[model samples]
Target: NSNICEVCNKWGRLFCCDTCPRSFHEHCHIPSVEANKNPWSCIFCRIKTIQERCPESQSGHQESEVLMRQMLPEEQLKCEFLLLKVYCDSKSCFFASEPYYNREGSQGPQKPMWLNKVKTSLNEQMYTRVEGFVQDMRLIFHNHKEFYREDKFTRLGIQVQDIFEKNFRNIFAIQETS
Candidate 1:
């Protein structure tokens, strides 16, 4: 082998790498680039990037985080009731069919009695106390759209299936969100 591959030391056509001056046969590199869609870089480049801790520029990835919302113990219960009404009666939300998501209740899906309290109030109801459900709904959902996105999840120092499901039972059942 007059001119051999640096890796296999076999005599054959070789491709000189851009990062390093070493020459290697098509199969002599750590990984062949023929099947790779992305441009190939020699091991030297890879090592340099890792050693210096450099991530190739993602010029436009301005912010990298989800602005998530957390639910209060009281709000969590009310949110479940509202979503169940939709999931059960209309089935409009595909999440109703999603596991881990639809597992909130074992009774399948059912209209929330709390929702009825809101609807009936318009036909003729009292506002002084219990029948004042409409106002309560407004209060619960107000600026509460944050609760809908389940990306922000953390529970007692452990990450989980979003905060809603993560703390649904064991901890939430025992302790209210303060």
Candidate 2:
């Protein structure tokens, strides 16, 4: 059977928009089937259109607001924690042979105690940090009674790093012992 449009119930072989996965028939949309091209607007386009036009009234408003506000803070802590975990898991950190430690002559690779501590700290910190961001976002949106929009995501990366670094210096200071 051909793909069906969830909105108009039209049958087609392809999705209407590049960002969406919904299928639609040429006849179901405007400009007639003859003017239809490979790409056309789909259900997602309609939803996005609605979202942009009146975000506060949209059904996804609350969730989108929460996501938009918290995404940067959550992602910032996560990226830093992941970087630390990867460093801890690296061969250099796991197999360092030093005279001060008996583990240097061990038969197998020795796990660094600092690495374990850092990993646990990373996990806990990341969880708490992300949850804090979510809570903050929810509070901001609820207090303002406004829905967050997509344009805010563009400024996320650098701001998140700055916030994470400023707030969690101790977590960032944990280093793997070689």
Candidate 3:
């Protein structure tokens, strides 16, 4: 939102979202918006409509689908899409591998998390619930915050986390409870 593309973190002909503070360059966005469209909304803002078009599961069963304990095929596909987005937004595959704790000495967290491990877990169907999958993704971001000092990398980590959360809420059609 600070005059820079959210994905690339670079200044360019940005496409500002009508519903959110986030902005992106033409190609930086997932779907890639062109300048012709006026009053464009970002992916997060448009998620409800997006999900409506492709609902992973049917609606109208609030009681039965109260808690999504099982990771259904559509949910799994959503997770895959989220991971793909993360991979695309992450600059130079920084979160692709495990952190170098040796270089940082004893300053880093022992329980390190990375994108590749999450991918492996997902592929193995280790996640019983969709929440478990979300937990692991959040853990990667938490570990990133724990590992990096206050720098550009850390800032990028937080930004990526924001992106992940936004997409998660949209994908799951989750509302803020409480």
lDDT of 2: 0.36
Residue 6 lDDT, candidate 2, scale 0-100: 43
lDDT by residue for model 2 over 61-80, one digit each (tens)?
A: 23333334342543444333
TM-score for model 2? 0.22
**Please, what is the whole-model Cα lDDT of each candidate in the order they appear?**
0.35, 0.36, 0.68
TM-score for every candidate vs. truth? 0.25, 0.22, 0.59
Supply candidate 1's per-residue lDDT for 153: 27
Cα deviation of 14, candidate 1, in Å: 0.6
Better of 1 and 2 by TM-score: 1
Identify the candidate with maximal TM-score: 3
Per lDDT, the best of the predicted structures is 3
Give RMSD to native, each candidate.
Answer: 22.4, 20.0, 8.1
Task: Give candidate 2 misplaced runs (Cα > 4 Å).
Answer: 7-15, 30-39, 58-178
Rank by TM-score, highest first: 3, 1, 2
What's the lDDT for residue 100 in model 2? 26
